Amino acid sequence: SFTVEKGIYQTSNFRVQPTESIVRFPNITNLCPFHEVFNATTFASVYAWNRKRISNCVADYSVIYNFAPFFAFKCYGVSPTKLNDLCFTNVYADSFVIRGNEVSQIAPGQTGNIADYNYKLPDDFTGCVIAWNSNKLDSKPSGNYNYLYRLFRKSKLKPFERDISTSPLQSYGFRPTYGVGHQPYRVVVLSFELLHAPATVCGPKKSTNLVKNKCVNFNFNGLTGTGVLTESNKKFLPFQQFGRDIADTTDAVRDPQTLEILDITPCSFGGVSVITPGTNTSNQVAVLYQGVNCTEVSNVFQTRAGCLIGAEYVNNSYECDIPIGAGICASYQSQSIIAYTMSLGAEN
Amino acid sequence: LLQYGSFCTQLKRALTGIAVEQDKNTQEVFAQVKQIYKTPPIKYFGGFNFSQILPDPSKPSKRSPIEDLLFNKVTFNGLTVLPPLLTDEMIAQYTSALLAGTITSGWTFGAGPALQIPFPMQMAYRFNGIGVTQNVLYENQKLIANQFNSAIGKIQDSLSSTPSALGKLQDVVNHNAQALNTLVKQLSSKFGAISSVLNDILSRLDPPEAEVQIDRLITGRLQSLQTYVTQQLIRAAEIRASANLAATKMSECVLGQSKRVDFCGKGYHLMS
Amino acid sequence: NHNAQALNTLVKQLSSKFGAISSVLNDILSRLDPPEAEVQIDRLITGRLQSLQTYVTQQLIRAAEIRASANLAATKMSECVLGQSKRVDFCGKGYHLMS
Amino acid sequence: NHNAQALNTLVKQLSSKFGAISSVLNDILSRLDPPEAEVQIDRLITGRL
Amino acid sequence: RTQSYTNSFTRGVYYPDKVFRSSVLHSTQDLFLPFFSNVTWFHFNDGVYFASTEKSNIIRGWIFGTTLDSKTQSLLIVNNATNVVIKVCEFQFCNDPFLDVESEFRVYSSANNCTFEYVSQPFLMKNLREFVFKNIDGYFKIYSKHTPINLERDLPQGFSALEPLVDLPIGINITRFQTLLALTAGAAAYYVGYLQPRTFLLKYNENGTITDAVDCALDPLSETKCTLK
Numbered sequence: 001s002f003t004v005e006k007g008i009y010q011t012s013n014f015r016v017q018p019t020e021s022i023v024r025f026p027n028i029t030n031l032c033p034f035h036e037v038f039n040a041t042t043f044a045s046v047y048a049w050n051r052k053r054i055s056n057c058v059a060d061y062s063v064i065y066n067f068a069p070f071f072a073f074k075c076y077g078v079s080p081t082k083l084n085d086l087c088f089t090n091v092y093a094d095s096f097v098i099r100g101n102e103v104s105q106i107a108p109g110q111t112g113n114i115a116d117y118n119y120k121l122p123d124d125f126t127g128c129v130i131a132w133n134s135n136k137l138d139s140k141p142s143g144n145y146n147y148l149y150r151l152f153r154k155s156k157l158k159p160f161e162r163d164i165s166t167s168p169l170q171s172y173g174f175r176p177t178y179g180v181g182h183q184p185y186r187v188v189v190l191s192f193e194l195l196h197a198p199a200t201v202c203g204p205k206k207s208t209n210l211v212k213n214k215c216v217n218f219n220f221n222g223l224t225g226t227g228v229l230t231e232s233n234k235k236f237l238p239f240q241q242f243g244r245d246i247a248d249t250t251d252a253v254r255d256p257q258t259l260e261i262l263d264i265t266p267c268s269f270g271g272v273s274v275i276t277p278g279t280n281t282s283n284q285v286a287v288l289y290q291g292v293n294c295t296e297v298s299n300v301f302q303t304r305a306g307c308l309i310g311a312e313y314v315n316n317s318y319e320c321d322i323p324i325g326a327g328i329c330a331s332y333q334s335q336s337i338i339a340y341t342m343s344l345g346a347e348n
Numbered sequence: 349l350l351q352y353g354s355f356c357t358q359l360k361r362a363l364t365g366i367a368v369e370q371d372k373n374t375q376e377v378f379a380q381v382k383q384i385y386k387t388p389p390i391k392y393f394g395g396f397n398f399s400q401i402l403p404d405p406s407k408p409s410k411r412s413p414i415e416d417l418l419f420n421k422v423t424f425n426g427l428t429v430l431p432p433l434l435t436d437e438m439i440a441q442y443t444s445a446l447l448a449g450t451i452t453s454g455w456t457f458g459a460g461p462a463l464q465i466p467f468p469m470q471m472a473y474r475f476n477g478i479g480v481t482q483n484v485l486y487e488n489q490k491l492i493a494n495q496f497n498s499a500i501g502k503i504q505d506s507l508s509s510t511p512s513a514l515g516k517l518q519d520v521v522n523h524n525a526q527a528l529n530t531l532v533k534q535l536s537s538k539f540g541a542i543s544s545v546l547n548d549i550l551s552r553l554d555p556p557e558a559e560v561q562i563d564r565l566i567t568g569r570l571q572s573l574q575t576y577v578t579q580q581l582i583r584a585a586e587i588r589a590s591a592n593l594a595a596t597k598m599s600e601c602v603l604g605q606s607k608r609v610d611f612c613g614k615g616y617h618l619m620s
Numbered sequence: 621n622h623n624a625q626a627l628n629t630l631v632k633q634l635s636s637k638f639g640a641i642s643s644v645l646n647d648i649l650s651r652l653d654p655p656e657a658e659v660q661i662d663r664l665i666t667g668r669l670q671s672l673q674t675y676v677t678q679q680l681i682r683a684a685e686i687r688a689s690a691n692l693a694a695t696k697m698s699e700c701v702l703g704q705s706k707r708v709d710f711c712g713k714g715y716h717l718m719s
Numbered sequence: 720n721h722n723a724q725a726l727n728t729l730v731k732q733l734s735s736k737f738g739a740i741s742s743v744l745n746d747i748l749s750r751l752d753p754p755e756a757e758v759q760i761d762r763l764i765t766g767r768l
Numbered sequence: 769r770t771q772s773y774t775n776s777f778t779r780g781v782y783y784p785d786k787v788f789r790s791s792v793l794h795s796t797q798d799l800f801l802p803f804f805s806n807v808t809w810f811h812f813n814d815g816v817y818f819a820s821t822e823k824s825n826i827i828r829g830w831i832f833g834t835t836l837d838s839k840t841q842s843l844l845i846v847n848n849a850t851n852v853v854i855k856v857c858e859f860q861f862c863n864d865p866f867l868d869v870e871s872e873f874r875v876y877s878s879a880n881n882c883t884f885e886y887v888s889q890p891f892l893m894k895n896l897r898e899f900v901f902k903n904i905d906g907y908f909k910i911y912s913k914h915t916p917i918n919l920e921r922d923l924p925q926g927f928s929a930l931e932p933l934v935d936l937p938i939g940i941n942i943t944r945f946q947t948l949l950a951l952t953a954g955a956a957a958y959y960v961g962y963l964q965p966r967t968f969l970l971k972y973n974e975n976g977t978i979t980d981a982v983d984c985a986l987d988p989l990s991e992t993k994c995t996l997k
């Protein structure tokens with residue numbers, strides 16, 4: 001409406017914007033043995049596949065991009081483009097070679113002879129599958145029959161297990177005269193375990209300096225967010241890292257590089273109310289910030305309901321006109337907006 | 349969320365209505381009189397001893413001993429609590445005004461100007477309103493005064509001894525605490541998504557693939573808020589009915605003498 | 621005022637999308653293939669059903685209060701108009717004479 | 720009458736499909752694979768809630 | 769090796785995670801040792817609670833394995849005065865292996881193959897030493913606690929937390945466990961108990977130390993306590 005009657009109205013909210021960004025990460029710069037996993041020139045068979053537990057090293061994946069022109073590159077739990085910022089609790093590597101037509105056989109919620117009799121995945125799997133042709137490397141002119149695959153088994157395989165006991169095994173025929181749909185492709189399955197917890201294999205990015213008593217963003221080894229970081233007094237035992245309360249929210253962080261306790265507090269926020277007489281009366285307003293001391297923003301007046309701006313406090317007491325809060329009222333009186341303590345009635 | 353509609357305006361309007369009603373309830377119950385009557389400096393009322401219910405000038409907050417015992421015996425992510433409009437001191441002043449008016453005038457100050465009357469004469473008038481003549485009062489003044497004094501004295505012990513004497517007032521606080529705790533604990537649910545943290549979802553998936561996960565959280569949180577608001581409205585209705593009954597009792601048992609049976613206690617009503 | 625604004629909100633709720641490509645049935649049914657259009661229809665169905673449920677619940681909650689006020693008015697008519705009431709402050713401020 | 724009607728409606732609500740392939744859990748479990756059974760179970764859960 | 773039966777009582781509570789809390793009553797669900805259970809007295813299944821009180825230091829190390837053969841890697845821990853060694857190497861155990869005190873021939877034939885190697889400060893230090901051993905999803909966890917005790921034939925009554933001691937990414941098959949001795953004949957005694965899934969209500973103090981617990985499936989009163997929190 002174009003006309004506002006006398007009263008107090010709640011318009012919007014206010015929040016304190018962050019100042020800067022703080023990133024912390026471990027000292028070490030060890031490089032993960034992903035190169036050793038790759039370009040081995042000898043990869044195990046589909047039914048007999050090796051494991052590898054990557055840990056205590058920095059994981060970089062652009063080296064895989066510069067390594068080979070991958071044919072297939074699928075990711076399920078995460079997005080391929082930003083693998084360089086996450087930190088994963090543990091890494092499991094599966095490496096083998098399968099026929100090109102059977103690349104799509106292995107996947108969650110998928111059926112196939114390779115899918116059920118060579119390697120199985122859980123429904124809630126998190127990870128990626130990479131594949132590319134190696135015909136010029138793993139295809140002998142007279143046929144490379146060293147690669148075998150299992151076809152027959154009484155029972156379907158459970159997720160995340162290896163079988164070697166042994167005709168169920170059939171040898172492959174790979175020749176350069178063969179075309180697409182039969183040439184061998186090397187495939188790698190990468191499995192992570194996201195736990196929103198401190199982790200070994202983090203990204204390549206580098207930390208910064210640490211500040212205090214200032215609204216700021218933070219990223220502590222994956223613990224992201226914004227707030228105010230202050231010195232803490234909580235008695236953390238050596239295995240204690242995080243902190244919680246009755247409401248199950250983070251309220252303390254262990255600094256990785258220099259082992260110390262930091263209290264986290266949310267930055268100031270609240271509601272804004274506008275006090276005004278009618279438009280046909282005057283054209284001035286006063287503002288009330290609810291539940292905030294005046295340091296966080298006649299000019300200022302501190303009450304129990306918050307911080308009042310634009311009104312002048314007075315000694316006298318009258319009948320209430322516009323209610324504000326804990327016993328305070330506002331009114332229009334050469335002419336200005338005044339605030340006072342209300343009066344209960346005439347003495348007698 | 350902007351695509352879902354205008355549920356937030358409705359939520360805000362309902363909560364604001366509840367708060368304004370909460371202020372109006374207290375205003376309607378307590379702000380009956382227009383004058384702030386004061387008790388005389390000499391407290392001699394024919395033998396009756398009101399010191400247990402009159403305000404105590406020694407202590408700073410100006411409350412009667414029984415009010416002190418009552419006061420002592422009763423014990424965020426976008427959620428705020430607003431302070432009530434009337435402080436406790438203002439309510440105490442209203443109560444003191446009502447007591448002074450009823451002690452010094454009787455039932456006259458509730459119908460117009462207050463008129464003086466000695467306390468024994470008022471008690472004779474009140475006896476004459478239940479079928480008992482005045483000479484019964486005037487010939488047994490000391491016995492009646494002693495009985496009243498003992499009856500007043502026993503109340504503090506009776507309130508202190510019984511543990512659940514003030515359960516009705518504690519239930520309101522307990523229900524509000526439970527509702528808020530449930531509402532804030534609902535934030536950690538997944539509702540069939542990969543995670544309950546928006547930051548992790550936004551930093552682990554492509555923008556086109558994140559909406560499918562975000563919508564589930566949005567729907568769950570909207571449903572939780574709607575349930576909380578509906579429960580609040582239903583409770584507010586009951587509290588309003590209670591406040592209306594309390595206002596009726598204040599007008600009929602305190603500002604006058606009631607003939608309705610068992611409305612102002614068990615027996616024949618005299619005062620309150 | 622309340623009875624008008626509730627209806628206006630209910631009517632204006634139709635143009636919302638509730639997480640669908642379009643907020644009109646005819647266009648979305650004409651363009652898309654039904655085997656994936658039925659889910660888009662279902663989203664709108666649930667979105668509108670929730671609005672109807674909310675409207676009905678609010679109307680019930682208001683009707684309870686109106687009934688309470690009507691009962692009070694009936695009592696005041698029976699006692700203050702058809703007789704003289706001795707209850708303090710029930711039929712006005714003072715000693716009641718009539719109504 | 721009101722109490723009886725409410726209980727009868729609540730009980731009869733169990734045989735609705737709520738936009739799923741069936742209204743019996745056992746039929747859905749014993750016909751579809753586990754990674755897709757949840758897509759149909761969640762609808763029933765939401766309707767009954 | 770003479771059996772006996774005794775009562776577990778309120779023993780064997782450990783910190784489930786690495787998160788600090790205070791002045792709260794939390795609820796958790798994990799494998800535990802139920803209160804008041806028949807634990808055995810010696811003179812694997814899901815996990816093992818081991819308790820000892822000897823002073824002569826005759827006890828050191830353990831044997832964990834499925835086939836008990838060098839063909840498959842079997843976990844073998846050795847503990848001596850200055851260090852502790854964990855070998856997931858392949859070991860062919862003898863009939864009744866033990867420490868010679870100092871050759872390792874009687875412990876195992878040889879280690880033809882090996883995968884995991886670890887060396888660190890020894891675990892072992894009137895006094896009672898308690899240990900919880902459990903493996904899950906390819907991880908090994910060992911919790912320990914040393915507590916001064918009075919003269920008491922049976923287990924003490926009270927509460928004491930089991931702080932985490934070591935985690936290993938071993939990821940092998942364990943089905944049976946045996947006790948290693950370093951010996952002249954003699955006698956020794958120790959307590960063994962088994963863990964199964966349970967739901968617990970843990971109570972924390974202002975300093976963040978577990979002080980009380982409630983077993984939600986012991987009796988109706990405890991179920992009421994759990995549902996009332």
Ligand SMILES: *[C@@H]1O[C@H](CO)[C@@H](O[C@@H]2O[C@H](CO)[C@@H](O)[C@H](O)[C@H]2NC(C)=O)[C@H](O)[C@H]1NC(C)=O
Nearest residue numbers: 391392393395396397398399400413497500501
């Ligand atoms: C009215 O009653 C009060 C309460 O008993 C009396 O105050 C007591 O007075 C005696 C003697 O002066 C003291 O021993 C008590 O400790 C007092 N009680 C309290 C709670 O302070 C008061 O004296 C009575 N008034 C009159 C006029 O007799």
Ligand SMILES: *[C@@H]1O[C@H](CO)[C@@H](O)[C@H](O)[C@H]1NC(C)=O
Nearest residue numbers: 025026027028256257258259
């Ligand atoms: C990391 O580096 C800092 C500064 O050089 C040092 O104080 C700290 O001890 C180091 N921590 C580790 C674990 O290397």
Ligand SMILES: *[C@@H]1O[C@H](CO)[C@@H](O)[C@H](O)[C@H]1NC(C)=O
Nearest residue numbers: 292293294295296302303304
């Ligand atoms: C003033 O603001 C500070 C925050 O800087 C707060 O700690 C303090 O309590 C406020 N003062 C009052 C009187 O509320």
Ligand SMILES: *[C@@H]1O[C@H](CO)[C@@H](O)[C@H](O)[C@H]1NC(C)=O
Nearest residue numbers: 313314315316317339340341
């Ligand atoms: C009244 O005015 C005086 C001026 O000196 C001031 O000290 C006092 O605090 C005022 N009373 C209030 C604000 O209640």
Ligand SMILES: *[C@@H]1O[C@H](CO)[C@@H](O)[C@H](O)[C@H]1NC(C)=O
Nearest residue numbers: 388389390391392393394466
């Ligand atoms: C009560 O009456 C007596 C006369 O016997 C008088 O002395 C006393 O002052 C009266 N009380 C008051 C409060 O004035």
Ligand SMILES: *[C@@H]1O[C@H](CO)[C@@H](O)[C@H](O)[C@H]1NC(C)=O
Nearest residue numbers: 838839840841858880881882
């Ligand atoms: C040790 O490993 C080799 C292969 O590296 C294997 O041939 C041999 O059988 C293993 N020794 C055992 C199982 O005792």
Ligand SMILES: *[C@@H]1O[C@H](CO)[C@@H](O)[C@H](O)[C@H]1NC(C)=O
Nearest residue numbers: 847848849850851852853887
């Ligand atoms: C104890 O074990 C360590 C582990 O390597 C070994 O170096 C040492 O010789 C052993 N004996 C003593 C007395 O430390």
Ligand SMILES: *[C@@H]1O[C@H](CO)[C@@H](O)[C@H](O)[C@H]1NC(C)=O
Nearest residue numbers: 161833834835940941942943
């Ligand atoms: C471990 O050993 C047990 C007993 O020999 C056997 O049943 C089981 O299949 C083996 N593997 C796993 C993964 O448990």
Ligand SMILES: *[C@@H]1O[C@H](CO)[C@@H](O)[C@H](O)[C@H]1NC(C)=O
Nearest residue numbers: 235972973974975976977979
């Ligand atoms: C908690 O820690 C403080 C400071 O060390 C200590 O004074 C207090 O006794 C502790 N509370 C206990 C041990 O219950």
